[PDB]
Amino acid sequence: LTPEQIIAVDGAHLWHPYSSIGREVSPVVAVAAHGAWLTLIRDGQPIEVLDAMSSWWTAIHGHGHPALDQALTTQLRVMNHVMFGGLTHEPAARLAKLLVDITPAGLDTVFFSDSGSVSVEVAAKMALQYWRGRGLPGKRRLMTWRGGYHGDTFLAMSICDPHGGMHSLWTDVLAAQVFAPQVPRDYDPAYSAAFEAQLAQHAGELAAVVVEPVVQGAGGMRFHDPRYLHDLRDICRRYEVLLIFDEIATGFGRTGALFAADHAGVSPDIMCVGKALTGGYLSLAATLCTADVAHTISAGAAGALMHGPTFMANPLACAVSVASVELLLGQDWRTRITELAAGLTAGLDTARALPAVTDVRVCGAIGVIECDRPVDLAVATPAALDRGVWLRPFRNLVYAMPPYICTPAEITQITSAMVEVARLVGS
Amino acid sequence: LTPEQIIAVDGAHLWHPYSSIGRESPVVAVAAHGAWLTLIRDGQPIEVLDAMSSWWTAIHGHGHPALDQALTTQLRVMNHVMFGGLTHEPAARLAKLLVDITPAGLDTVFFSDSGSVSVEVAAKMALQYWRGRGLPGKRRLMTWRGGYHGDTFLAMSICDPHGGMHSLWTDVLAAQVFAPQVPRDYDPAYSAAFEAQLAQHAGELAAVVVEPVVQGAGGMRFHDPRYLHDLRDICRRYEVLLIFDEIATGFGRTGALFAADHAGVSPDIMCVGKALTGGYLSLAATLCTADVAHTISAGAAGALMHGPTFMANPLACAVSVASVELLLGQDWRTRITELAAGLTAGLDTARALPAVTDVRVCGAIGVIECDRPVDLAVATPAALDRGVWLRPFRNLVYAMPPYICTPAEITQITSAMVEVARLVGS
Numbered sequence: 065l066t067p068e069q070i071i072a073v074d075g076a077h078l079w080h081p082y083s084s085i086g087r088e089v090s091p092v093v094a095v096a097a098h099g100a101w102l103t104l105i106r107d108g109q110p111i112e113v114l115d116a117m118s119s120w121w122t123a124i125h126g127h128g129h130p131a132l133d134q135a136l137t138t139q140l141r142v143m144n145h146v147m148f149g150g151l152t153h154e155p156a157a158r159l160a161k162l163l164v165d166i167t168p169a170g171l172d173t174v175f176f177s178d179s180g181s182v183s184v185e186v187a188a189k190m191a192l193q194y195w196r197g198r199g200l201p202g203k204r205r206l207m208t209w210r211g212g213y214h215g216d217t218f219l220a221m222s223i224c225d226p227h228g229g230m231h232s233l234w235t236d237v238l239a240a241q242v243f244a245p246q247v248p249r250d251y252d253p254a255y256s257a258a259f260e261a262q263l264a265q266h267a268g269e270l271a272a273v274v275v276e277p278v279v280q281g282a283g284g285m286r287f288h289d290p291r292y293l294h295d296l297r298d299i300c301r302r303y304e305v306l307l308i309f310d311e312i313a314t315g316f317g318r319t320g321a322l323f324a325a326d327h328a329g330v331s332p333d334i335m336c337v338g339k340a341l342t343g344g345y346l347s348l349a350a351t352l353c354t355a356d357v358a359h360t361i362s363a364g365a366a367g368a369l370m371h372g373p374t375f376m377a378n379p380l381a382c383a384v385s386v387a388s389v390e391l392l393l394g395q396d397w398r399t400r401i402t403e404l405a406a407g408l409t410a411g412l413d414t415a416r417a418l419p420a421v422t423d424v425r426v427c428g429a430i431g432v433i434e435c436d437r438p439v440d441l442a443v444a445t446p447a448a449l450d451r452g453v454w455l456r457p458f459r460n461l462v463y464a465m466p467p468y469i470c471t472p473a474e475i476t477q478i479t480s481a482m483v484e485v486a487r488l489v490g491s
Numbered sequence: 492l493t494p495e496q497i498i499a500v501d502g503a504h505l506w507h508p509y510s511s512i513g514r515e516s517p518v519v520a521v522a523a524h525g526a527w528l529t530l531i532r533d534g535q536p537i538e539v540l541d542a543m544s545s546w547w548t549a550i551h552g553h554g555h556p557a558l559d560q561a562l563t564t565q566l567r568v569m570n571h572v573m574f575g576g577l578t579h580e581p582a583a584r585l586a587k588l589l590v591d592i593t594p595a596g597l598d599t600v601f602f603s604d605s606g607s608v609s610v611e612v613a614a615k616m617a618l619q620y621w622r623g624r625g626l627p628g629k630r631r632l633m634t635w636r637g638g639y640h641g642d643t644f645l646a647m648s649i650c651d652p653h654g655g656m657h658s659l660w661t662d663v664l665a666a667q668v669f670a671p672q673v674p675r676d677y678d679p680a681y682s683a684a685f686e687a688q689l690a691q692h693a694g695e696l697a698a699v700v701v702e703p704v705v706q707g708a709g710g711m712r713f714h715d716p717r718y719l720h721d722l723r724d725i726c727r728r729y730e731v732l733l734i735f736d737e738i739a740t741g742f743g744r745t746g747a748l749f750a751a752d753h754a755g756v757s758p759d760i761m762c763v764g765k766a767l768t769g770g771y772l773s774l775a776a777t778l779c780t781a782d783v784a785h786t787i788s789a790g791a792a793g794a795l796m797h798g799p800t801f802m803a804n805p806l807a808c809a810v811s812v813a814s815v816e817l818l819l820g821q822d823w824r825t826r827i828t829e830l831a832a833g834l835t836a837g838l839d840t841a842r843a844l845p846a847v848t849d850v851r852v853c854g855a856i857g858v859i860e861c862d863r864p865v866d867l868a869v870a871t872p873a874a875l876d877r878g879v880w881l882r883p884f885r886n887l888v889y890a891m892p893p894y895i896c897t898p899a900e901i902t903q904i905t906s907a908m909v910e911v912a913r914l915v916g917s
């Protein structure tokens with residue numbers, strides 16, 4: 065199909081995410097991706113632009129990395145997929161061993177699934193089944209703080225920010241969960257004391273606290289002091305409420321630590337990972353839990369964990385994930401991310417002086433220009449493309465989560481485009 | 492890793508589906524090619540038939556050269572890009588194929604990453620539809636018993652609450668409306684009763700959701716396609732949407748391209764998955780009519796706020812395009828008829844077995860139903876001894892073999908199935 069043909073079929077038959085159909089955006093045709101770069105069709109002509117978004121925060125080693133391509137083709141040659149019901153295999157074993165070794169201590173059990181939203185559903189199921197296994201089925205609600213996002217399936221939606229979150233129109237049909245106020249950027253003991261007070265009054269009906277550690281992504285690219293996670297861990301411990309960290313966006317080095325929990329030295333009872341898990345090649349996610357959680361879940365009268373995605377532990381997805389994680393661990397990723405952060409900080413600093421900019425902030429390989437108004441994609445997208453960068457703002461944010469392989473020059477091209485988008489926003 | 496090292500790691504760290512940890516032992520798989528798996532039995536690698544098609548996905552068998560090549564072709568040009576703001580050739584080629592081969596009127600495609608997600612998307616579409624019509628009270632689902640629709644919490648709510656796999660969770664799930672178990676043979680009184688029950692709930696129902704013709708994970712039950720014609724009629728007259736979940740029945744499995752085709756009926760919304768990718772990669776899709784898509788988009792809500800990270804993944808779409816074209820490029824209907832005949836002929840003798848209550852076949856689906864639960868500890872090694880990978884569940888010994896299975900291979904599969912049933916009764 066020609067780009068023309070692709071656009072026609074697309075307009076007629078494809079529903080895009082977070083969109084209407086008809087009077088929708090109008091997507092740009094992508095025809096190739098290599099390293100940090102996408103080949104897009106603009107006015108009938110192919111242009112090369114930097115994938116500043118890492119393809120929604122997944123392509124940490126860039127596209128078509130030789131190690132990941134090879135890992136995929138090697139597995140393809142021997143075994144594409146077998147059912148995980150009754151069978152196991154090397155890629156599943158290798159990936160699970162890697163995951164339990166690099167995640168916060170105590171997470172020794174791995175349940176694979178096909179997507180981040182599903183892994184969150186699995187996390188909640190683990191938490192609820194845990195308490196059923198202890199003969200306390202009243203412990204069935206979740207608690208979180210505002211500003212959060214945990215995916216788009218219906219249980220996941222129930223812990224999305226109920227007022228400004230993308231799922232706010234659904235609140236009347238969602239499970240009603242417990243929400244603490246927005247966690248602040250700077251550490252304030254009074255906030256943690258209030259969180260504890262609120263949790264204490266609901267402790268008998270709470271299965272778990274569920275939060276994104278350090279960085280809240282889709283809810284506003286907000287950062288908070290890691291010490292709050294230390295307080296959550298302690299509160300949950302004392303009141304016997306499970307602690308769940310959703311690291312689907314923060315995992316695999318993105319915030320400057322291997323996992324954002326590591327900024328706090330905290331181990332949750334349950335953890336979700338996804339997105340950058342496969343290096344952005346294929347859909348895969350995982351839910352990890354402690355031995356105590358795993359063993360209790362089938363205690364009393366609860367029985368087996370009745371979850372089993374058809375493509376659970378897919379050998380192809382697991383094999384590229386093994387390669388992606390090994391590639392990350394086999395380099396000095398900590399210095400790499402530090403250099404990326406310094407580059408983002410340096411390149412975004414001029415945005416602070418722009419009239420429509422309210423904040424500039426960087427955490428690891430995350431760079432954010434917060435604006436005083438919602439960012440118009442119709443203006444932003446071509447402005448970024450004109451400067452050789454693929455950017456997709458959302459809410460009032462011009463942000464990047466670039467591939468780890470970006471050179472300092474490429475980072476400066478990305479930040480330059482961001483600043484120019486923000487400049488255009490304010491005029 | 493060696494097989495023993497894999498077993499060690501697996502036992503320590505891997506949670507398997509529908510199981511407990513440290514109380515459930517998996518067999519190591521080291522290769523798969525065509526209709527055969529290479530498994531490790533007592534230290535020896537053996538080749539056995541994938542009678543389950545790896546949970547009903549591997550319709551062209553494993554490592555089919557056309558599908559392998561499609562994947563490797565796409566890998567060299569573009570592994571993945573975000574579907575937010577971008578589009579691409581594999582998504583367009585796949586959407587065009589699916590719109591063309593599905594029941595008439597299904598012209599919009601929302602891709603997702605798994606069957607259960609595609610079901611939640613379908614439900615979201617149905618609820619958002621009625622909101623766009625100013626009827627937000629229409630928010631419950633109706634289905635019939637014996638059904639299965641996945642494992643996420645909304646999907647669980649339309650699993651049969653009495654004896655379906657999610658039955659222990661009834662007290663926490665959304666309470667949906669359940670009609671009685673639909674019978675095998677057509678009885679118009681069943682439809683009239685379904686209508687009567689639906690009528691009293693019509694003002695609060697967004698949709699009827701069912702598996703058409705074959706109910707899979709809820710018990711491998713078959714029903715007359717005329718029931719689906721009745722549901723189309725009832726939904727039309729009472730203004731309730733009709734959703735067909737064809738995640739198990741799609742792509743030829745029941746003898747028609749989609750099971751809905753047996754009834755000559757189109758749902759308003761349709762889910763597909765599993766065999767969509769030929770069993771290579773996780774992918775699913777939710778299709779809807781122009782009416783549904785436009786009504787959603789014209790509502791105050793506006794956008795459908797759903798967007799899986801790996802939505803319309805190029806690699807998954809590329810292998811699916813190849814799998815679908817490979818199916819359409821051959822006489823699949825004759826192939827399935829031949830498979831059905833082979834299954835019928837090979838399972839016939841099981842009818843006489845003392846613990847067997849029914850034998851039934853529908854397209855490339857063969858079922859022995861027993862009078863008691865089937866013990867995997869007896870069934871699994873028995874079948875492996877006969878060169879077949881079988882996974883019974885509940886009281887069912889069944890197969891959903893790759894379409895490429897030879898008559899000899901089908902003979903081998905059915906013989907193992909008969910032998911497992913024989914052992915159940917002793």
Ligand SMILES: *Cc1c(COP(=O)(O)O)cnc(C)c1O
Nearest residue numbers: 373374605606607640641738739
């Ligand atoms: C397998 C299946 C699903 C869910 O698929 P997963 O990939 O396991 O989420 C949903 N509905 C039906 C009818 C199925 O057979």
Ligand SMILES: *Cc1c(COP(=O)(O)O)cnc(C)c1O
Nearest residue numbers: 179180181214215312313799800
């Ligand atoms: C992206 C994301 C999810 C869910 O991801 P999908 O892959 O879209 O299902 C969940 N939680 C967080 C924090 C995320 O960033």
Ligand SMILES: C[C@H](N)C(=O)CCCCCC(=O)O
Nearest residue numbers: 082120282458575798799800
């Ligand atoms: C796509 C995935 N579900 C995700 O969490 C990222 C969404 C956050 C950005 C919203 C947008 O780009 O429109």
Ligand SMILES: C[C@H](N)C(=O)CCCCCC(=O)O
Nearest residue numbers: 149372373374509546708884
């Ligand atoms: C979601 C799951 N893979 C599925 O729907 C098919 C499995 C149903 C059979 C249940 C078993 O084999 O134990």
